[PDB]
Amino acid sequence: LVHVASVEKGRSYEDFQKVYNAIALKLREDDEYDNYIGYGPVLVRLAWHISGTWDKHDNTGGSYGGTYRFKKEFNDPSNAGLQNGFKFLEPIHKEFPWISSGDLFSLGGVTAVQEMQGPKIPWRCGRVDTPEDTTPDNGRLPDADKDAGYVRTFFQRLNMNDREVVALMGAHALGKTHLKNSGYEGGGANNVFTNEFYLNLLNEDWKLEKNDANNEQWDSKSGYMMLPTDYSLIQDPKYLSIVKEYANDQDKFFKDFSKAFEKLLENGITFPKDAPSPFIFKTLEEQGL
Ligand code: HEM
Ligand SMILES: Nc1ccc2nccn2c1
Numbered sequence: 001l002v003h004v005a006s007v008e009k010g011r012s013y014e015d016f017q018k019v020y021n022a023i024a025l026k027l028r029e030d031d032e033y034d035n036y037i038g039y040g041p042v043l044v045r046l047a048w049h050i051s052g053t054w055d056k057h058d059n060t061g062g063s064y065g066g067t068y069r070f071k072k073e074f075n076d077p078s079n080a081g082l083q084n085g086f087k088f089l090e091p092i093h094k095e096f097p098w099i100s101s102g103d104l105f106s107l108g109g110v111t112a113v114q115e116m117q118g119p120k121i122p123w124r125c126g127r128v129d130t131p132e133d134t135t136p137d138n139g140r141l142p143d144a145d146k147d148a149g150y151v152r153t154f155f156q157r158l159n160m161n162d163r164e165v166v167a168l169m170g171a172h173a174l175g176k177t178h179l180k181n182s183g184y185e186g187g188g189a190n191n192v193f194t195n196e197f198y199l200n201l202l203n204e205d206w207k208l209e210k211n212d213a214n215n216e217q218w219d220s221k222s223g224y225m226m227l228p229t230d231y232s233l234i235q236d237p238k239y240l241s242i243v244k245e246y247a248n249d250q251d252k253f254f255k256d257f258s259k260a261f262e263k264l265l266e267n268g269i270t271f272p273k274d275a276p277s278p279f280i281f282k283t284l285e286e287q288g289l
Helices: 013-029 040-051 083-095 101-115 148-156 162-173 196-203 228-235 237-247 250-266
Strands: 206-210 216-220
Touching (some): 013 040, 013 083, 013 101, 040 101, 040 162, 040 250, 148 162, 162 196, 162 237, 162 250, 196 228, 216 228, 228 237
Antiparallel strands (some): 206 216
16 A cells, blocks of 8 residues: 655645744634643644554555544544644635645644744655545554553554654643543643653652543642653653653754654655655744744
8 A cells, every 4th residue: 555745736845834834823823722722732633643543564544645534533532632623724724725634734743843842843745635435443543541561562553663652752741631532631731842741750759640530640749640651651661761861861852753753744655756855844933923
């Protein structure tokens, strides 16, 4: 099963920077969402959930097809809450109807990371919408109530190794859990991309508690929380080494996250030899906008 990237006809860097800018300007404008977190974190989770359906074994799922737009995937219980991200992106898609769905969902995640002061994430165009029957079934995204061994095995399906997994999980610096969405009770409200996930894991006094949905999570006196799968990164000795590394080197985390996130967003896509190079978009700040 081969998905060849096909550049939206006649489009170039400038076209995609315009889309980036529209996203980034709306992110700035819609500042009240989710107790003033804004839409940055949900857009990052959207880009992850549309990519994280991928199966390396048969190349089903993945970001290429834009299949989140179809009800089976839209309605996946694992995707509860992401409708907010999709709604945010709808007027962008109306303004730029030439962009493919996969390109828009993935670019929304790139834009959010960068606008939240995260690393530059190189991004390639050419995802092509595929039909409804290519929508992967529900149940390919990960459970949160599980241990390090589960996390490790789960991520092998996405061709991610220990360092990639640990780096990617640093996105959990962003946003919060919502009991109605996932059965986890959120802590904090952060919308600035940092290595704080690792620092929190290592430095907080964690207590294993039950939340109002009767699920276990790790909570600290300072009001932070971790999923069991988050906390598993300091229970497993191989993950722990990497957590300590990112807790002590913001730049290394940024670089590794950028690589792993691009890879996640590109899994399943064959880029022709004469495809454009990855684009690195300027932030609104860098443009003086
Ligand atoms: C074992 C892997 C993972 C599990 C079990 C997991 C689980 C969760 C759960 C349960 C929530 C809360 C959803 C809600 O209640 O709204 C959450 C939020 C989030 N996740 Fe993950 N996640 C995982 C990996 C990742 C990865 C790899 C990324 C991105 C690189 C990511 C980015 C986020 C973001 C940005 C939010 C916040 C969204 C918001 O605030 O609206 N997650 N995730
Ligand atoms: N959105 C999320 C999801 C998990 C998490 N653990 C600590 C902070 N976190 C934020």
